[PDB]
Amino acid sequence: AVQQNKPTRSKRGMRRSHDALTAVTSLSVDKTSGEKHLRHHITADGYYRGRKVIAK
Amino acid sequence: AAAAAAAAAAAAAAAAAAAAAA
Amino acid sequence: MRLNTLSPAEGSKKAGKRLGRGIGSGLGKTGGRGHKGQKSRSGGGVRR
């Protein structure tokens, strides 16, 4: 499992071409407060469509 | 801080008498 | 005259063969000792 001849910056870049990152495509704004939380996700302050399901 | 730089293990000559060609 | 306008005569001095200093010199990778034999090691040659 040795190497035989040495790849360069070419291939050590090109292996990142699929392994790189994809951003989150859009966050969401709450329907009764107006702040930014993820989709199908509670906010920090205990909001998920209105009701205070949790304290913090 | 800092640290050292180890080396030179008793590398057992890297082989037995594996290639028994006789 | 001074200490800067003197010279030896024509060809009284040469450079000495720095035998073992390159390729373009005319002298090189063997170094005046040929190849592979007892004329090509330390302690080279033989006795008288």
Next chain:
Amino acid sequence: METIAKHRHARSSAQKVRLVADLIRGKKVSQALDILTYTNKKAAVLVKKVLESAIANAEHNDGADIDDLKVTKIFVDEGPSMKRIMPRAKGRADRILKRTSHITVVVSDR
């Protein structure tokens, strides 16, 4: 109207930091927080911290106000990688390279 802010000798790699710092090139700093607050790498807390410090230094010292800023240049270095010794088998050892990165963030409107 450039504003530097830097952060040096931090426990991150030299090839994981770019995997989050290739998201903050050419965005309003609102969106540059709405991405950094939910990308979930380790360096997503460090670059968030330094972007906060940058936005504050523009808030203070060069006349700038918060939502004006557009993140122009961001690039990360290879810091002083200090080293350890960990045993592998048979007495063999290794200068394992604890890499680090000099994070730089340059924000502006221009």
Next chain:
Amino acid sequence: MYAVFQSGGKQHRVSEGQTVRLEKLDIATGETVEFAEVLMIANGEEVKIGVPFVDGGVIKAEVVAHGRGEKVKIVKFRRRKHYRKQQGHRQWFTDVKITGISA
């Protein structure tokens, strides 16, 4: 409109105002050189072909520059039989202005 003639062991091709490069002639800088040894002269289908040269053909030339060219390398080498050799050669050149063509 143009003509064609020999110099420098060659066969160049000139026209009026064409600053052409020749390999060096032993004449000075701002001087006047003639050649009657043209071969073809075309002046809008006034075509004439000259073996060996053309009888009434004569140019008018004014030499301008006597400069030298480019340090271009001569690099001889052989594989592992231990022989390299460097050289840098620059070849002289001489410019004219064609001031007139005559047939």
Next chain:
Amino acid sequence: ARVKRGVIARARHKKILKQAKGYYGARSRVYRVAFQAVIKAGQYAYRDRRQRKRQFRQLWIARINAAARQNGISYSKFINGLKKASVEIDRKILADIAVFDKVAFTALVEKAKAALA
């Protein structure tokens, strides 16, 4: 007496690396493969200087043969018709004329055809 050589070494190396601006991968960055590549560059610049007169002769004859075939004669009998009228044009000027002054090319093939026929 204890000659440090750092002044000589990098002034030697940077001349070769300045010679090697524009090669792929290592050999415009590394030193001791670039010296191997620039000598190969020297050998190729030696060989193609000999071969440029091969190749432009290898090129001009195609153009003169094409225009002579347009006028309706092959290149070999064209050069024979040139030598029989003994006019000492080479195959550079004719390769110019066959592109540009095609009317003079037609006059020339007419003269060589009448000198051969």
Next chain:
Amino acid sequence: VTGSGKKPWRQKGTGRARSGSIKSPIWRSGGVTFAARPQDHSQKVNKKMYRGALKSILSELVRQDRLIVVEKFSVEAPKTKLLAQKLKDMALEDVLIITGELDENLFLAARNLHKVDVRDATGIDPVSLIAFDKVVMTADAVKQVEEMLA
């Protein structure tokens, strides 16, 4: 170079390069190949040709007209403040003065003066003889030169 005269690792076995000592001169903190011992770079010239050198260079000095001779060049006090005022009217800047007897005063007044050395008449030398602009001499001291070159 002192210390370890043992094999640092054995010959075969470990795939490093072969090595005999830390004193091996291709290493850090080894010896060197060919550093010298203390020596003496002084060669030997012959007496006839060494006197021929002083026979020749004074001839060339007179042919260059860089030689003054005076009856007695002296200042009669061990005090440099008059030597560096006599010479400025002698119109000299860096000269050698030679004298017959071992005078004390001229030597003392010229010791501080860095350019104007005063040798004796016996122990003159070719290199400091040639290395000046003008050389002045003494009516008595030149006769020892007369006797010893001839």
Next chain:
Amino acid sequence: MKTFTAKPETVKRDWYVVDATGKTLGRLATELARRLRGKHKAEYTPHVDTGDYIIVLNADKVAVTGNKRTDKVYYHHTGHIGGIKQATFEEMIARRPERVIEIAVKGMLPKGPLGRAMFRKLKVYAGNEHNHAAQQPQVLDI
């Protein structure tokens, strides 16, 4: 000044039609090859496509001289290891009557990207009519 070289935006390109009725395959192929490469147009340059467009039609009318109609074997190969696929002339005309010219011109064209982009400009056809009448070609009856 350097020797004249042709430039591709202003190089010219013609449109011609040559019918393959009863012609020797090689003695048509070398003619169409040298016309495709452009050893007849005066502004030829080896590294620029100074070429043209030639239509060939009615490929089932090529005459091949002698007993090569059973001993002109077309060999091609899959990549898959049992595949030394072998097809003779009349079977080749039956299965696909177009490769019979394109192979013989793919030989006599250069094996680089110049000729391999040139080989698109040999738009052969099986029948006596076509769909390129808007180019309005001329009969290059060689």
Next chain:
RNA sequence: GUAACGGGGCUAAACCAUGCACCGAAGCUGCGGCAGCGACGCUUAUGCGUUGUUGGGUAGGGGAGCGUUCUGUAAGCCUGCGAAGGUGUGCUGUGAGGCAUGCUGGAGGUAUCAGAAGUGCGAAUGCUGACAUAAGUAACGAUAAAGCGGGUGAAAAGCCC
């Protein structure tokens, strides 16, 4: 894997017989340039113009040198208007290579002939010191096993309860 014309392909684009043309190299010749050896006359830089002729090239022999450190010309010359070192450009000798100069750099370099050398890096499975490579891969040191509430905090899967 055609696969015992190089390939396309060729009934001539083959073979034999005769020619007339042409391609075809660093061969040869033309034009410019340096260098050898020998001529010959010299009008000396101790020979200088014509003149012939030669110069593929390892081991190897003989010649002509380029450059780095150091002393002696130096208690000189250059430099805070910018010295050594790095960097880019721009010229220049047949070459090792120099001169000039924009930028960084903030105290030394150094003529010209000469002298003495730890005097020139591609190796040597050389030696130290740095950074790459596999690679953001393997692995995380037992298959006894963790889940939850509360607190501390900016922080909890392990830290306290």
Next chain:
RNA sequence: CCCGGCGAGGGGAGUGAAAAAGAACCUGAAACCGUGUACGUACAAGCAGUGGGAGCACGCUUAGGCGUGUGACUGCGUACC
């Protein structure tokens, strides 16, 4: 004084001629990994260059058409000891 964990680490403000002289500190070159600009690259086979050469961007400048950077396309070409 500002960010940040009352931090580490930075950013202005002031020390000095100079803080890419800020204590990991004189000068800071190469391998090296970075960012930005110009060009090229997804029908293309190979010791990576050389010779011809396209087009494109940018430079002194009366267009004088030349230097510069890339090098599509193509002739030849199996590294060094």
